[PDB]
Amino acid sequence: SHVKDILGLINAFNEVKKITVDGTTPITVAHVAALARRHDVKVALEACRARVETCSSWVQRKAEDGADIYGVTTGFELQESLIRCLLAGVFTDELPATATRSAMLLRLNSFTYGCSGIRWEVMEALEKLLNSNVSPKVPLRGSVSASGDLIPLAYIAGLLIGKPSVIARIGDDVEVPAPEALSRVGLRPFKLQAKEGLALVAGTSFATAVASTVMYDANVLLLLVETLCGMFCEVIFGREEFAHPLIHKVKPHPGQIESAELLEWLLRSSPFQELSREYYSIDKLKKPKQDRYALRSSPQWLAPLVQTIRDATTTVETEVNSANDNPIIDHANDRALHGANFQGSAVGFYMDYVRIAVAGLGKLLFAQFTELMIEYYSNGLPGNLSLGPDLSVDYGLKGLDIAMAAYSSELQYLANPVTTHVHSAEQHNQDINSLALISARKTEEALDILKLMIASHLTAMCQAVDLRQLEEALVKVVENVVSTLADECGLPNDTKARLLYVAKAVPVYTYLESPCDPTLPLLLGLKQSCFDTILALHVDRLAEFEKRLSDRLENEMTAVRVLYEKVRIQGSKFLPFYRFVREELDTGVMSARREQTPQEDVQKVFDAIADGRITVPLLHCLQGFL
Amino acid sequence: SHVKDILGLINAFNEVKKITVDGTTPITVAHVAALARRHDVKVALEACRARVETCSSWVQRKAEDGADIYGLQESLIRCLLAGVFTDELPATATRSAMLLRLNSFTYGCSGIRWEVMEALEKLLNSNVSPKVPLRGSVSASGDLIPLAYIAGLLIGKPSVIARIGDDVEVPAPEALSRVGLRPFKLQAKEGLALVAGTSFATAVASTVMYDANVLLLLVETLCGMFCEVIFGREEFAHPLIHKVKPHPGQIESAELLEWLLRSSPFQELSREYYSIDKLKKPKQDRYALRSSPQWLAPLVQTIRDATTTVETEVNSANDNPIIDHANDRALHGANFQGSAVGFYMDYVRIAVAGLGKLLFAQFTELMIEYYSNGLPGNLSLGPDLSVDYGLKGLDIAMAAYSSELQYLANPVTTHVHSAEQHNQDINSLALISARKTEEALDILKLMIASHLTAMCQAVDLRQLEEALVKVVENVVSTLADECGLPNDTKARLLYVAKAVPVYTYLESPCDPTLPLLLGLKQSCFDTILALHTDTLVDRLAEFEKRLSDRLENEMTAVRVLYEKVRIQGSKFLPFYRFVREELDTGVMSARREQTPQEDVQKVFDAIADGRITVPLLHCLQGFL
Amino acid sequence: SHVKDILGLINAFNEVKKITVDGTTPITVAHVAALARRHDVKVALEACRARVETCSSWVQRKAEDGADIYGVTLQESLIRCLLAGVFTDELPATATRSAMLLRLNSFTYGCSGIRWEVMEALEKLLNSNVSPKVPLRGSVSASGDLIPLAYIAGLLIGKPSVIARIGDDVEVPAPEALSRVGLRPFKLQAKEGLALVAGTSFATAVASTVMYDANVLLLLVETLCGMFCEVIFGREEFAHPLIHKVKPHPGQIESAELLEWLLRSSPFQELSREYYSIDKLKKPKQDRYALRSSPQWLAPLVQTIRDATTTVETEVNSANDNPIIDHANDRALHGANFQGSAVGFYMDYVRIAVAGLGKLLFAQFTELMIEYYSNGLPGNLSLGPDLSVDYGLKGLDIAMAAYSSELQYLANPVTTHVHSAEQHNQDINSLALISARKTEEALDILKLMIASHLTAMCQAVDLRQLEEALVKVVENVVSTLADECGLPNDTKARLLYVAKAVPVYTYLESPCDPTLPLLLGLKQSCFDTILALHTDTLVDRLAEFEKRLSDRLENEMTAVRVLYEKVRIQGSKFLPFYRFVREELDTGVMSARREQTPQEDVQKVFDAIADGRITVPLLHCLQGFL
């Protein structure tokens, strides 16, 4: 199951201490993201040294004898004129330090295969620069990722040779010219030898770097969305039967089988499904017999998205663990091979697909959130998940709802392809080019939006948990009060049962605002039954009932709500999430008596998604799934 | 290799006589496409009839016992006959949908009566199909509206028009009558079982995927032909390059190309070309050839993976509720949600645009003298270029094709509206997306037709080039002797004959401002300098004037003789023999009356109707 | 002419000191950009005050006698639910302050019912450089830019959770910011929440600076087409009035009118005419489409940018909240002026036209880089002479493909992605702010492209001036050497023709290399003259001519070039640009001997475009055009 695979990526991301760069051990997207995000993670380049020096020697010696090799004795001092012409970005905005360090890692890794001809010493400086948090400041734009990420990779090369015009960061604050930065790590500027410039600049390392953190994020956010579909079922009063294994067995898209399996398992002994079953047995024939598509067709919807994100992961890893410059030095057979491994099309095209898949995840979230906000579609929940009880001053999550439309709309726009925009480039030499870095940045942007939408959805769902539990205790108060008052006023066993059915059946949020308002559904249902009881038994005791109802009911309803603001989740697989958001992030049910704005509440959830903390409640939630 | 899988697809498409519909044997996209395109292909529904009737009974008794299970038949059909004829889904698509609908029922999950399945079988084998409006489906509770027309036929709705073969259109009840069928009276769940599936989107997506594999393999193969005609360096396909960047589609396309090019007689010409003036010609090819395997990689992988996905859908139960008769329960889900197909249709449309861009970049190089390594502009033979604009019209059209193709490749799945009283708040739009990918494949066929035509033109021009340089060498060689020029001079003069690209002076070979005379004039001056005399000048002035006695006439002769060889040793011979002999074409010129349209139409039609698979399989004979 | 109108816009941007906010004087996009970018520009709210108070009191009257009017007869609960954004990125201070101006201005029509005192506080915050930190996303611009405008309201009422900037570094909670500028938090009255949050000010603010830049860059691109004509050896005939008279799109007539005028007395068009008169039959009779069809291309772009300007200004000068208080007739009118669709759709269109501008630039730049298309210029505009170590502007060429590609991708529409939002109440919504933001990103790229293009054309001017000088040196050396060796008139005139005819950049790298075009052409003519005059004596003198040529010629080509490194532009209408880039910004002809990277040169041009300095040489260039 892709589920086990993704938990694998998360475990690795958290547990990895050193990244082994040795020309044999595969680097994964977790490793790339870990190096990028956790500064305690160190590169360990393992002396593959033999093959690196053999390649390096071959190239150097062939250059002497005038072998006719491209980018060595051919046009594109020959090496540094190439760096100079490629130092051609503009600061308008820049590639982030995380992407630059990831790129330095991928470049280093590509050299270990012994196909590039770079000197072992250059690799050692790359390793050292990474472990000392030194990285060049790199302009955002300029690459078409075809002869590689030439311009942005020239800033790494520019660092290595001490161009005074390249600015390096050292940690978060220090910014000094490149020669100054090499001084501080005990390095001197390299003087580039044969093919070394081309080896440094002509790779896929920048696109593939952005694509790696993109793909680790996509795997994690994917599993998160899938999981939260289970939570959505619980709060919306869904029918877990949509995830029945036979439905998916007869339409066996692997991602449709696997997501449904996660969901069946997540809901098997759900105490919320218990409540759902009961809700649908009351007024049985007046409520929908099936859920709406955002829940009911989620496994069918998730299927191509799972498969896209998983296959794209394989592709980006293949790229990560590749020699991606040119020529490819085949030293064992004494020849330089002329190809185009720097063409970043594998990554470019899969970035376009992943952005569309991410947009599809966003649309699933939007549709679920929309249902949750509307009383006609939320099976008892109040509009905008407003607690009130005074609705005139509690518009609930309305602002978050409007934002969810804004998020989804911009996200769908972003998912148009970049790879359809190929220009005939570089004096028409690069007449196909992958635009992979550009596509990877757009997909990254799309993930930024998905994270916002996940944060909002989880927040709304936590709010829905509270509202559902509050509903269960509120109904019990109404049932108790109606029951005991019926005793006091000495009403018949016909009238009692009839009035208790009403107490059980009316959705409490329809009259929470003013429980004894004669125009609201509680007293309407009660009036109806009172008339029915009269004709069936054919009064003083009834009229005293109605009076004694506006003595006890409202006060006892307030009392219980007030208690709650100062349970079924405990038995739910989603407890870890609820506990995380309520306890660990220090939040509570949203209302006019809670000072914090939606911003303050969702910011906490968003930050937790952004920094990886969300993976703890997620891993807890899924414990035991096999 | 995906290459062998695609060959297997083509073989199965060609061979199959009967499609086994049995609930166990997979239907592939080759079968769907064969049913659609070859009317001698018949459906054979195998009496799975047991589980079909069990399921049917379970539903039919839960109705007589008056149980209450959610999921009157004619009212569902009536509200869904809601399309409009502006345009329509073609008979090939409708018949494909009928097959997939038929197949969906075999798993015994749907509850439709067996006799309805028999009726579908009969209608398919009788070439009866309803006329179906093009639009209306969001492919979520299925392709409701379009599938409603098949159900409308089965119940003999008079407003539903049915085709019988290519010429006969009759109202539904008359079409049923003509095949010995009577209108059905639908039973419990049967209306829903007929309408609530993914069969139309999946039908289009099947013919789209079959076509995508064939055109993919064709484009990959023709990259080798491109190498041959452009004077490429075959070394871009070397297995090691691709072993160290091991995307499966990169390895596998390079593999085919290494093999296609290994003993190539054009590669031999290419080598001799880069040996002459070696250090004044490009060391590497441009990206449209040299990075073709890297480019092809994601396209091969996308088209292969999408094929798996669409075939899974072909072989699914995709209505609702799903009847679990064994466990006495109707299961409420949404297998009618076409999202697996929808998403992959968007992806394939992007891959198809990528194949188109590869073709456009290659064709562009071939038209431009600066990038074509000796070939004339527009692949114009002339010799008189003022009245021969060659393939310029096809060049312009290739930009037209690529531009529209790139536009088509924007996604459909990003346009999800909250639909049907907000019940279908997610919906796949699979049929719409599949239609756009189909439209994108139509344009790619145009681009392939054009590209292959242009390469056959280039084969002719390369063969003519070799024979023309030989004439020039002989004329220079023999005249040198006859004028009594020294061996110094003769050899210098012959080098020029060898080295100057013939298409740069073919127009007027003895023109003193054109590259042949220019090269000979500089060589004549260097000879005078190297040997110093008045006699030498006499013989050199004689040599020059006697050039316009013979040269032109002999170049014209060998040309006219060609109009009225290396390709025989090339793996692409079958393609060239197919386009030239079988289709009846020739080297394009002002002297050949046929328009580019006439030539390219022939190639296009052969691609359209699958005849092109014959030279393709021939070409790949022996590849493992 | 739109040219005068755009010149008016720039003059206004430059010379404005106070923005009159009075409810009758139109605010133009120049005024908005002036306010955003020039902090010395102050808002002057001119007491208009009378109608504001009438409206204010009407609303407060109804609040007093308890009338009941939807939308008017609470505020802090509206603001609270709308503070629902998340910091991921933020709307920049320049956008926020522009939004504050537009919101202030909207109130001046007396239709909003906001208190004059709130207005004066807006003016004061503006003039004191206070603005809220506003999250980037959340608006669908339909019931207004609700979420982002809530942060302005949150500042005004002193919400602690609302962080305010004061100038560039200072960030303080909202109460502190108000206190630093001598204001106190407001208690919002009836209808004031809505007045503040329910408008189009954010989208229209971004759109205003977008339209000012679109106008300026448009004129700049139009003007630089003439510069392109000069350096590429174009035929100015393409701009002839009769061509455009018979196809009279207003933007086609006016762009061509400008270009005809820029090129009328061009000293470069003189070199061009001379160039085509030598070997007339071997050189193209017409320019390629990026020049020859530039008027037809620019036409829809001119017209889009101008009509879009009108629309955006109409919106700047509007009351755009709801309900519309018609105090005069004792009514509140219920509509939807907060629906940002006028701006949303026109932002989509302007983004497409900007993409069309970028494509024009990309195609021009492409021609310029390729010797086959550049009529004498070296590939990549490489000076060399040693081209093996001088790849010239190849980096910038690659960057231009990257720029154009991402730009075309951005130009897909946002308005096609309308979701059914806010409980399906906002079932149409404009997405205006999202679209404006994408058009702004498109303009960022266009700025990059213009910077590169202008830098390339300055390089080309230098190469053209050197070319004229080099050919003169060659002619002189050949003319003098022919004399010194006593060559006949026949020989001398053939040899001098070759000197004039052969493009100097094809042999500059090694002028006496016998396989390069100078010697090739000389050898050819020498054979022709030996035949025409037919002797042992002539051959003697031709050999001595050749040996003296390889002693002297190169030394004298180097000298003139080295001197050039340490004229026709002086007569050119583009002198201001050239002088601006070379002297003002301190740059020089690009080569292996100039230390500054392409980055450092282009940064300087881009910075001048980005901060407005480029309008000086632009306005200088256009002096006299009426």
Residues A211 and A341 in one domain: yes
CA distance A40 to C597: 36
Considering only CA atoms, which of A397, A357, A417 is closest in space to residue A226? Answer: A357
- In this structure, are C581 and C528 located in the same domain? no
Task: Find residue A170's DSSP bridge partners.
Answer: A134, A174
Domain coverage including residue C260? 201-466+568-626
> Would an 8 Å CB–CB cutoff place B399 in contact with chain C?
no
**Given an 8 Å threshold on Cβ–Cβ distance, is C448 in contact with A88?**
no
CATH number of the CATH domain containing A119: 1.10.275.10
Are B428 and B556 found together in one domain?
no
The structure's method of determination equals X-ray
CA–CA distance, C322 with C326 (Å, rounded to integer): 11
- Give C550-555 contacts, CB < 8 A, sequence gap 24+: C550/C512, C552/C477, C552/C481, C553/C474, C553/C477, C553/C511, C553/C512, C554/C510, C554/C511, C554/C512
Question: Measured between CA atoms, how close is C533 to chain A, in angstroms?
Answer: 44
Closest CA to C446 of C559, C354, C556: C354
Residues B624 and B552 both lie in one domain:
no
The Cα–Cα gap between C304 and C354 comes to 10
Give the three-state DSSP class for C423: coil
The length of chain C in residues reads 626
Which positions ≥6 away from A596 have C-beta within 8 Å? Answer: A587, C161
Indicate the pairing of strand A18-21 with strand A42-45. Answer: parallel
Written as one string, the DSSP assignment of A30-77 is HHHHHHHH-TT-EEEE---HHHHHHHHHHHHHHHHTT---TTTSS---
DSSP string of B47-102, one letter each residue: --HHHHHHHHHHHHHHHHTT------HHHHHHHH--------B-HHHHHHHHHHHH
SS3 B261: helix
Q: Is there a contact between B329 and B382 (Cβ–Cβ < 8 Å)?
A: no
SS3 state of residue A20: strand
Q: Using an 8 Å Cβ cutoff, are A110 and A85 in contact?
A: no
- Does C448 contact A90 at a Cβ distance shorter than 8 Å? yes
Sign of CA dihedral B274, B280, B281, B284: positive
Contact residues on chain A for B416, CB-CB shorter than 8 A: 363
- In chain C, the residue whose alpha carbon lies closest to the alpha carbon of B411 is C412
Chain B CB contacts of A246 under 8 Å are 322, 324, 331
β-pair type (C130-132, C163-166): antiparallel
* CA atoms of A601 and A586, how far apart (whole Å): 9
- Opening angle at CA B310, ends B161 and B194, nearest 5: 35
Alpha carbon distances (Å) from C100 to B147, C134, C151, C184, C270? 56, 12, 11, 18, 53
Q: How many domains does chain A have?
A: 3
> Element (H or E) spanning B164, and its range?
strand B161-164
Q: Is C35 helix (H, G, I), strand (E, B) or coil?
A: helix
Distance CA B572, CA C219 (A): 54
Task: Give backbone dihedrals phi and psi of B580, rounded to 5 degrees, phi first.
Answer: -80, -55
Q: How far apart are CA C411 and CA C350, in angstroms?
A: 9
**Residue C544 sits in the same domain as residue C528:** yes
Residues C536 and C582 in one domain: no
First-last CA distance in chain A:
8
Strand, helix or coil at B21? strand
Inter-chain contact C387–A87, Cβ cutoff 8 Å?
A: no
Q: Inform me whether the C-beta atom of residue C585 falls under 8 Å from chain A C-beta atoms.
A: no
How many A-B residue pairs are in contact by the CB < 8 A criterion? Answer: 247
Residues B12 and B159 grouped into a single domain:
yes
Put simply, the chain C residues between 349 and 388 with a CB less than 8 A from any chain A CB are: 362, 366, 369-370, 379-380, 387-388
Residues of B in contact with A322 (CB under 8 A): 244-246
d(CA A31, CA A18): 9
For residue A288, whether the previous peptide bond is cis, meaning omega lies within 30 degrees of 0, is no
d(CA C99, CA B175) in angstroms, rounded, equals: 68
Nearest to A459 by CA among A600, A555, A601: A601
Does one domain contain both B343 and B408? Answer: yes
Exposed/middle/buried for A339, CB within 10 Å: 0-12, 13-18, 19+?
buried
| Residue B491: how many other CB atoms lie within 10 Å | 14
SS3 B424: strand
Using the Cβ of C397 and the Cβ atoms of chain A, whether some distance falls under 8 Å is answered with yes
In angstroms, rounded to a whole number, what is the distance separating the alpha carbons of residues B195 and B318? Answer: 10
Residue C207 near residue C95 (C-beta atoms within 8 A): no
Contact A353 B309 (CB under 8 A): no
Task: Return the number of other C-beta atoms located less than 10 Å from residue B482's C-beta.
Answer: 12
* List of chains touching A (3+ CB pairs within 8 A): B, C
d(CA B430, CA C86) in angstroms, rounded, equals 35
Please report the sign of the dihedral spanned by the C-alpha atoms of residue A508, residue A513, residue A518, residue A519: negative
Name the nearest CA neighbour of C389 among A62, A425, A84.
Answer: A84
Neighbours of A523 (CB within 10 A): 22
Pair (B387, B488) in one structural domain: no
Question: Amino acid letter at B93?
Answer: A
Do A423 and A302 fall within a single domain? yes
Contact between A55 and A329 under an 8 Å Cβ cutoff? The reply is yes
Q: Helix (H, G, I), strand (E, B), or coil: what is residue B130?
A: strand
Identity of the residue in C520, C531, C539 whose CB atom sits nearest the CB atom of B533: C539
Q: Are C223 and C176 in contact (CB under 8 A)?
A: no
| Lookup result for tokens 């506003």 | C134
Structural tokens at position B231: 């004077």
* DSSP letter (8 states) at residue C566: -
Chain A: residue whose CA lies nearest to B325: A246
Strand partners, B330: B323
Of the residues A174, A204, A234, which one is the last residue of a structural domain?
A: A204
Q: And the tokens for C253?
A: 């007539």
Q: What is the CATH number of the domain that holds A545?
A: 1.10.274.20
Cβ <8 Å between C420 and B418: yes
Q: Which residues pair with A136 in a beta bridge?
A: A168
- CA–CA distance, A582 with A588 (Å, rounded to integer): 6
Q: Determine how many CB atoms are found less than 10 A away from the CB of residue C424.
A: 15
A564 catalytic? Reply is: no
Residue A350 shares a structural domain with residue A392: yes
Under a CB-based contact definition with an 8 Å cutoff, are residues B456 and B579 in contact?
Answer: yes
User: Taking a C-beta distance cutoff of 8 angstroms, is the pair B552, B510 a contact?
Assistant: yes
- Is the distance from CB of A236 to CB of A55 less than 8 angstroms? no
β-strand pairing of B18-21 with A134-136? unpaired
Could you say which of B162, B178, B198 is where a domain stops? B198
Q: What is the CATH number of the domain that holds A579?
A: 1.20.200.10
B positions 544-563 inside 8 Å of A (CB): none
| Same-domain check for residues A108 and A256 | no
**Annotated catalytic residue, options C70, C372, C373, C497:** C70
Q: What are phi and psi of B322, to 5 degrees?
A: -85, 125
For residue A252, give both structure tokens: 């066996």
Which residue type occupies B612?
I
Burial class (CB in 10 A: 0-12, 13-18, 19+), A474: buried
- Residue A189 in contact with residue A162, Cβ under 8 Å? yes
Q: Say what the resolution is, in angstroms.
A: 2.1
Label residues A155-191 b or e (16+ Cβ within 10 Å = b).
bbbbbbbbbebbbbbbeeeeeeebbebbeeeebeebe
Which tokens sit at C605? 């041009």
Question: Looking at this protein, which amino acid is placed at residue B251?
Answer: I
User: Which tokens is A483 given?
Assistant: 């029951």
Q: Among B145, B179, B198, identify where a domain stops.
A: B198
At residue C19, φ and ψ (nearest 5 deg) are -100, 115
Closest CA to A361 of A436, A416, A437, A412: A412
- What tokens were used for C181? 């500028």
Bridge partners (DSSP) of residue B21 are B45
**What residue type is C501 in one-letter code?**
A
Q: Where are the alpha helices (DSSP H) in A269-397?
A: 271-279, 293-296, 298-320, 345-373
Residues A458, A221: Cα–Cα separation, whole Å: 12
Q: Which residues of B touch A330 (CB under 8 A)?
A: 240
Residue in A closest to B239 by C-alpha: A337
Which residues are A18's β-sheet partners? A42
For residue C141, the SS3 value is: coil
Query: Residue B202 has which token pair?
Result: 């999946």
Written as six digits, the tokens of A446 are 């799309």
Element (H, E) at C44: strand C42-45
Interface of C with A in 407-436 (CB under 8 A): 408-409, 412-414, 417-424, 426, 429, 431, 434
d(CA B309, CA B340): 7
A135 — phi, psi (to 5°)?
-150, 145
